[PDB]
């Protein structure tokens, strides 16, 4: 949200078809209208969701059931019970569910009443997705640090230090795995790729130009996951600097001026992304050609635009599910199954689409 | 009435260590800068030490250091009592 332009009119295309067998279950107290990384992940066609106050639940495929509520408040003050701020989101792998927290704690819980969970102290609060790679759960904590954890309890943990910009925008920089190497955006435009075994060969590349350029109150943050395509990663700073980088520790930086806060989605040979002003545009797999731009949802809370059935499914701040064509970016279907908006990345997998809501009303899409 | 204090603080060991014929520089180093002076003619320093506690007697010790231009031959006149 930046209010550069006023909230733009939204044309409505009526869709006579509603998602089938679709349930809206409330997880915890809901996340409210505050943006964070808490978003459900599905594994084995089972939904895993989490909420602030350390409240984690699971849901079944249809009419969400197997709801085992686990509240995690241990090691969070032995004199009083306080809501351990979870902000690391949910990542599922090997039957283990990894969650960050703002008390510097990484939780790893199990399937089938994973009340027995192992938790690790991490230097600084954990705000990024704990992404998995080659049997290590690695997390970008907003002390400018990268940490790795083992699947069992964490035994091989190595730290990588990053730049301290002292002015940040909620570093959500969840790393991406390519060729056994983790590549991440920095908290101020230092895209770096490191290997395992102590994360050596630390090489940094400057992408953002708004860091230390008199544009700094809480700006110039790379809060987006640097998606890898064909050994090429795409890095988006908060203000401009959409740069393409080659995963050979090179110095070749070619870029187009676009700044964003949410993840861009590369599907086939196409890129769909949401700018920092909340409008969607499409670009080529390689280059900076703006194929189309939809200007009908300006400055309304938008998440990462996810591709479902070859159709861009997006969620606004007023609870409208928009199916948009992927060739010129026009609305082709509109649904209203929730009266509250959305501020967390939806997920499309296992023939299902998962959307988490402000009020925790998780909605399932099976078209 | 309040207690009244006037002049340099003199202790018995500060005057016993002032002996005949030294220089005024280390005299000012030891006893401090005198709060009196003789502006008329010869340079003379008067270390006056007066308590007037207010409910009892006035106590004065007057130590006159008379010096020549060279500051030698310390003419020391110590009166430990107000006559």
């Amino acid at each position: 949200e930046e209010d550069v332009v006023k909230m733009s009119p939204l044309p409505t295309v009526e869709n006579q078809f509603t998602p089938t067998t679709a349930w809206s279950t409330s997880v915890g107290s809901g996340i409210g209208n505050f943006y964070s990384n808490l978003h459900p992940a599905l594994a084995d066609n089972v939904v895993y969701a989490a909420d602030r106050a350390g409240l984690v639940k699971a849901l079944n495929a249809d009419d969400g059931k197997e709801i085992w509520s686990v509240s995690l408040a241990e090691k969070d003050g032995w004199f009083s019970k306080e809501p351990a701020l979870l902000s690391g989101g949910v990542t599922v792998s090997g039957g283990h569910v990894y969650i960050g927290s703002e008390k510097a704690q990484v939780y790893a819980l199990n399937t089938s009443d994973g009340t027995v969970a192992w938790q690790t102290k991490v230097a600084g609060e954990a705000l990024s997705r704990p992404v998995v790679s080659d049997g290590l759960v690695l997390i970008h904590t907003s002390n400018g640090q990268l940490q790795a954890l083992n699947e069992a309890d964490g035994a091989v943990k190595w730290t990588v230090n990053l730049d301290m910009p002292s002015l940040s925008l909620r570093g959500e920089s969840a790393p991406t795995t390519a060729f056994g190497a983790a590549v991440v955006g920095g908290d101020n435009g230092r895209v770096s790729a490191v290997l395992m075994e102590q994360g050596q060969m630390i090489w940094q590349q400057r992408i953002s130009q708004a860091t230390g350029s008199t544009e700094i109150d809480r700006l110039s943050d790379v809060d987006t996951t640097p998606v890898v395509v064909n050994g090429v990663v795409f890095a988006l700073a908060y203000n401009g600097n959409l740069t393409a980088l080659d995963l050979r520790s090179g110095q070749i930086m070619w870029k187009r001026e676009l700044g964003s806060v949410n993840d861009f989605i590369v599907d086939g040979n196409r890129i769909y992304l949401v700018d920092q002003n909340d409008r969607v545009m499409a670009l080529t797999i390689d280059g900076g050609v703006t194929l189309w731009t939809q200007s009908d949802l300006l400055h309304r809370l938008l998440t990462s635009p996810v591709l479902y059935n070859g159709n861009l499914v997006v969620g606004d701040s007023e609870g409208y599910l928009h199916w948009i064509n992927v060739e010129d970016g026009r609305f082709v279907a509109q649904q209203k199954v929730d009266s509250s908006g959305f501020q967390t990345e939806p997920v499309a997998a296992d023939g299902k689409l998962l959307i988490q809501a402000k009020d925790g009303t998780v909605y399932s899409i099976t078209r | 009435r309040p207690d009244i204090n006037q002049g340099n603080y003199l202790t018995a060991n500060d005057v016993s260590k002032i002996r005949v014929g030294m220089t005024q520089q280390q005299v000012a180093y030891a006893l401090g800068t005198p709060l009196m002076s003789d502006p008329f003619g010869t340079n003379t320093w008067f270390y006056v030490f007066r308590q007037q506690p207010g409910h009892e007697g006035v106590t004065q010790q007057t130590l006159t250091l008379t010096f020549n231009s060279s500051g030698v031959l310390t003419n020391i006149d110590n009166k430990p009592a107000l006559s």
């Binding site: 949200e1 930046e2 209010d3 550069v4 209208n33 505050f34 943006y35 003050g77 004199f79 009083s80 306080e82 701020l85 703002e102 008390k103 510097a104 230097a123 600084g124 609060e125 907003s142 002390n143 301290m164 002292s166 002015l167 940040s168 925008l169 909620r170 008199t214 544009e215 109150d217 809480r218 908060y238 806060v261 920092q276 809370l301 | 009435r1 309040p2 009244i4 204090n5 006037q6 002049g7 340099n8 603080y9 401090g32 800068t33 709060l35």
Partner: protein
Amino acid sequence: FVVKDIHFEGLQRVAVGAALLSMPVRTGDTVNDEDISNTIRALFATGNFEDVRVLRDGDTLLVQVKERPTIASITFSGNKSVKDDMLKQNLEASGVRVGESLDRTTIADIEKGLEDFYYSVGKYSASVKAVVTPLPRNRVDLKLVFQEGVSAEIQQINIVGNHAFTTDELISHFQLRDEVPWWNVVGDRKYQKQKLAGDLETLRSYYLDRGYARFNIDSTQVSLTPDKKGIYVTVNITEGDQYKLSGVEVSGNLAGHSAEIEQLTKIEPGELYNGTKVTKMEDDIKKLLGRYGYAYPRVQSMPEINDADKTVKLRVNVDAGNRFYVRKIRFEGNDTSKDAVLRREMRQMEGAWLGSDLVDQGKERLNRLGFFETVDTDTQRVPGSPDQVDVVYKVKERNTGCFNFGIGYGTESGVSFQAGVQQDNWLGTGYAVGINGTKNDYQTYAELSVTNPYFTVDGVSLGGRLFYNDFQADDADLSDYTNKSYGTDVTLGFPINEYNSLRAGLGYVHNSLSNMQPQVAMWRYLYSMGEHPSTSDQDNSFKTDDFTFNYGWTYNKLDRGYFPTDGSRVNLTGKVTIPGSDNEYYKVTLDTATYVPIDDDHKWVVLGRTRWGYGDGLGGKEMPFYENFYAGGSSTVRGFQSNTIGPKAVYFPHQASNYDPDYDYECATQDGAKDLCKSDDAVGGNAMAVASLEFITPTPFISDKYANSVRTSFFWDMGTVWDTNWDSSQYSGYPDYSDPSNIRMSAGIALQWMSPLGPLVFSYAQPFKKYDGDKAEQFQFNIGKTW
């Protein structure tokens, strides 16, 4: 071609020096068309002229420059929740003020600064547009348009790294919280950066005080959302181990004060190491050395931390300098007060050893005068003198000749006015000149008091006041008699100790009594001396001129100006009539108030107030009836009418025809009753005794106006008034007023709040032992002091 002269065309608001420095060429230089282009580019790049056009009209360079337009005004538009004052001072501090040069890039600079302070004050989602309007004579108008959004509250301050203390108390040390708003009533919670740095320092000090000597803060991140509805700040810290201070070692040059500072050094073992305690003992070492004349002691304490035993050792290295002497004491800012007035109130003498305690005492006494806004002391050295020092008391002078007021009330008891001028420093001469005026429903009193607090340099005060007094004939528990008094008294008062002060003075009074009601309490005095008034006829007059020797003593052992908690205040006031006047008598009054604490924090404390009065004639004369004592109301026994406890008036029969406007008065219906009329009217007596035993309890309300400005009190009050000259032997069937019995006894609750006008007293008492039909005063109320 060749430059011969520089012609300034269109230059209005630009100095010649800036243009001469900015141009890249000089007179006589070879200038071509390329040089003209270079000159135009340099002049445009200097940020002084918006437009530059240089032409060569032969050998003359005509330079037509449109300057940077002078800001005609700065206007803020759409300000619904922002004031223009902080906006204007922020703009001026940004190097941009009304009249200065304004550039195209300075639009971005002003927008960025203003938006940065909007994000500082939490007024986020605001779009700041700086629109430009031209105006002739090189003028510009910069209008700011604000697309203001919602305010951002503190959503969470994350203290990561807590394993011994909860975040909640640490945040309570912060001023930035998420609870119900207390500093706003229409808006919401709010952020500021200077308090963030201050409260980060408070967090560090808090952990150093609790015992964590290895405490360290690793990082501080500022967390702002792109949404801009909530504020987060992360303070990543590292707690240490709770360290126990084992013992303090002091070394250095102590100048013979070792046994005095060693007993101040070291703490009982087992105590936690506190950084504040270490700084406090360093400050106390500095003050101890300052008391003896050492004003600049080189003092620092450094610890070793032995983490093996969790112990801390302190070396307080102290070097005592030279015994500094006050060469000269200077006063600054006393533009309208005698320097003698400022120099009387000082305990440090010029040309003496420096007493830092004496200098602080001088500052405290100058504050106690009340003539000054602020008193500041800078003990600044004399240049070139290693032992001399000059003490300066910078005072901000405020004129103190300010109108004061005070008001009381009581149910069925009327109001009381206490208006007055109180010029407490006349012309800066340190003379207190006051005109005070008290008004009741039965009494007026005007007074002109001129006081010299220093008639002698020791502190002897000479105070003379001229008083006029008048009692009406209104039904207010006082007899109907038109008496007017006027007098002058002069009192010399001196302190025989810092808590004991004696007073002695002479006072002349005149009383004119006209048409007194016939009654046998004062008619006994009228029969004692002078003429013999006629019963059943008030057409009478009585004029007295009295010369009295007044004396007194005041013992003040109390503390605190807010609310007394310990010590006894005794005020003895006596007066004996000098021979050579129309009356002969003596009065003695004793007013004692004792505060004793039964609590270490002095929350529960005991107040014993007691007021004795005895007045008796000398020789064959008698006590004058207008100098009688009275009890009841505020400052005495409460729950009874103001001045209502005591002997009740015994009216004689008298005619209905009266000088008073109304004939509905009692005992004067047509000719009076056949026998003496018992009235409920109060005339006082020769003697009085009041005693209040009271308990002070802490207030349950704190943190809104605090418990130091409000006091709650539960009291019992006894009061008797009797005249020793009452003869009940000849008066049977009437209450006996000769006995000291009939002690009217009551009790109640009182609340005292310090209003900025002055003390405010509200009391709810109840009289549950009253005699002869007294009057109840369930509510008692007062503001300020009566003086």
